Design a protein around this ligand. Structure first.
Ligand SMILES: NC(=O)c1ccc[n+]([C@@H]2O[C@H](COP(=O)([O-])OP(=O)(O)OC[C@H]3O[C@@H](n4cnc5c(N)ncnc54)[C@H](OP(=O)(O)O)[C@@H]3O)[C@@H](O)[C@H]2O)c1
Ligand SMILES: NC(=O)c1ccc[n+]([C@@H]2O[C@H](COP(=O)([O-])OP(=O)(O)OC[C@H]3O[C@@H](n4cnc5c(N)ncnc54)[C@H](OP(=O)(O)O)[C@@H]3O)[C@@H](O)[C@H]2O)c1
Ligand SMILES: O[C@]12CC[C@](c3nnc4c(Oc5ccccc5F)cccn43)(CC1)C2
Ligand SMILES: O[C@]12CC[C@](c3nnc4c(Oc5ccccc5F)cccn43)(CC1)C2
Lengths: 282, 266
């Protein structure tokens, strides 16, 4: 029947009223998907009927996610276990994931290195690992994924934090890695716009989320209201499906009222006339 | 209100000081009568800067040549600079890895080198300098860019490294405030500057007015001396009207009522 079927989900209003059917049959990669928000995203995509490839270091926990994804109604579900500290693994994982699904529509970059709250003193090893895992691997994954994403006019979804937009104590190395994601991905988004690379980039700015690891890490130090992981995961997916540049998800209504930087948007528009990129794209 | 006398007899480190803005900062400090230790890879060009600093009126001037790609050099450089001067009042972090304008395709080696040189070495230099800066109630001056506050095409890796500096240094500034570490942190947000390397790199690509390097260097020094959190220096008056993020300042204040750090500092 699929051979005799054709058409498009993305008509009038698909910019921007989300429908779960926008993900039906989509080929999606989810990193850091054995637990937390990543696992919740895998589950939502499964229910939507997407093809899913999940990653994390633990094959046993990834197996459980895959099995549950198949139960939920995933078109297909696979896992490839490995560390995002290993740039060769990051690069080969994408080729292997694309081969399993026959392409790629959405790349969800969610994994981070294990981090606890502490004052910065002399842990350079954690600053470097944070930059390698939380930032550099996202770039390596993007490079490996781009040819397939260009072919499908796909999407890159980057999971960040409010600590990737404002300063927050006790998470300096982590904040540095999240700010780096904004600088990198927002700059290449301008490059893609002028180069006519029809690959959307969604930066997801999340507040505190009720994941097991975050609740343990912040216990007794951060007393703010945590937001539910299930709804968080859905808002990330929605943002990527609607090709939104930025997603904001937090418990506080004051955050939503204040995080947006209209001055940055205006400045970027003003500076867009300061350059002549003709030699780079012809 | 700044006075050149605020730098008289001050012990100052200037990185990336053999050329451009860094060299201009060394010269201003020399005229102000500061003790100066300059760094970059080229000993021959550093020798010229030191010699000119002494002519301009520096209380003392030294150089130590090396690469900021080498974290051990970054760490040992601070100890030696401090040994030469008998302490440290101001740490000016200015050096960057050589960068040209290009679309990002697959140059992961440049993204990593940018992060290592432009960001990681600044952190290593700060760790090595902190005990001396705590002793003098000193200052850390971080040289960034408008590309470290807003997105700009052709400088993705560079922009990522400048954004990282904001996240890192602005977070430790909050930590220092609660830890009662009396070391100021000045983030300098610069627009296009008429340095020889920038003018060559942007030739035919970027046509916006470049601001003078001499005045840029002075504004950086002023900001550090006044212990300002952020310095904004650009040719355009519309930049000055728009770069500031008062909402970020408000949000940071609103979120500080949500955490308790008195378990890490007592
Ligand atoms: N939770 C919050 O309050 C909060 C707030 C703001 C932003 N965020 C963002 O939300 C995203 C997900 O966070 P979360 O709280 O859901 O995290 P999480 O539950 O702790 O899960 C992190 C995931 O990454 C994997 N991972 C860890 N180290 C890895 C490595 N070296 N290589 C590959 N995968 C690795 C973990 O599995 P394995 O250990 O088996 O590898 C796991 O699947 C992150 O980008 C985080 O910054 C979360
Ligand atoms: N110029 C602009 O338009 C502009 C705009 C915004 C912000 N800024 C910021 O201003 C600062 C200074 O820029 P500039 O234009 O003055 O640059 P510059 O003239 O090109 O000088 C860069 C300096 O860093 C040194 N350096 C390069 N690679 C190094 C390495 N591996 N290890 C140690 N030192 C190294 C160079 O010396 P050696 O090669 O001999 O080592 C030189 O002294 C930078 O932080 C830059 O981001 C500049
Ligand atoms: O793996 C983890 C290590 C840190 C982590 C984490 N990710 N983002 C954050 C954060 O951002 C915030 C910044 C400003 C206001 C509210 C926030 F929420 C504040 C505190 C912890 N945050 C919690 C557990 C991610
Ligand atoms: O060493 C160099 C490599 C890039 C370099 C450089 N440093 N900052 C920038 C920049 O920021 C800007 C961002 C937005 C508006 C105006 C700007 F100015 C725009 C273009 C080049 N920029 C020019 C030569 C630094």
């Amino acid at each position: 029947m699929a051979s005799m079927t054709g058409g498009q989900q993305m008509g009038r209003g698909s910019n921007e009223e989300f429908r779960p059917e926008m993900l039906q049959g989509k080929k999606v990669i989810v990193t850091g998907a054995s637990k937390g928000i990543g696992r919740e995203m895998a589950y939502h995509l499964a229910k939507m009927g997407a093809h899913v490839v999940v990653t994390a270091r633990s094959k046993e926990t990834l197996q459980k996610v895959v099995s549950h994804c198949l139960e939920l109604g995933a078109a297909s579900a696979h896992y490839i276990a490995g560390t995002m500290e290993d740039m060769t693994f990051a690069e080969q994982f994408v080729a292997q994931a694309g081969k399993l699904m026959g392409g790629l529509d959405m790349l969800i970059l969610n994994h981070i290195t294990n981090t606890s709250l502490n004052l910065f003193h002399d842990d350079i090893h954690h600053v470097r690992k944070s930059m390698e895992v939380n930032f550099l691997s996202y770039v390596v994954l993007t490079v490996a994924a781009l040819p397939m994403l260009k072919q499908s006019n796909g999407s890159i979804v980057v999971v960040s934090s409010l600590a990737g937009k404002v300063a927050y104590p006790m998470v300096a190395a982590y904040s540095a890695s999240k700010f780096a994601l904004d600088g990198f991905f927002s700059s290449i988004r301008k490059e893609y716009s002028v180069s006519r690379v029809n690959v959307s980039i969604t930066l997801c700015v999340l507040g505190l989320i009720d994941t097991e690891t975050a609740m343990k890490a912040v216990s007794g130090i951060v007393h703010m209201q945590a937001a539910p992981k299930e709804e968080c995961a859905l808002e990330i997916i929605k943002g990527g499906a609607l090709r939104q540049e930025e997603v904001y998800y937090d418990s506080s209504r004051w955050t939503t009222l204040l995080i947006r930087n209209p001055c940055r948007k205006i400045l970027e528009e003003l500076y867009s006339t300061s350059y002549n990129m003709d030699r780079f794209i012809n």
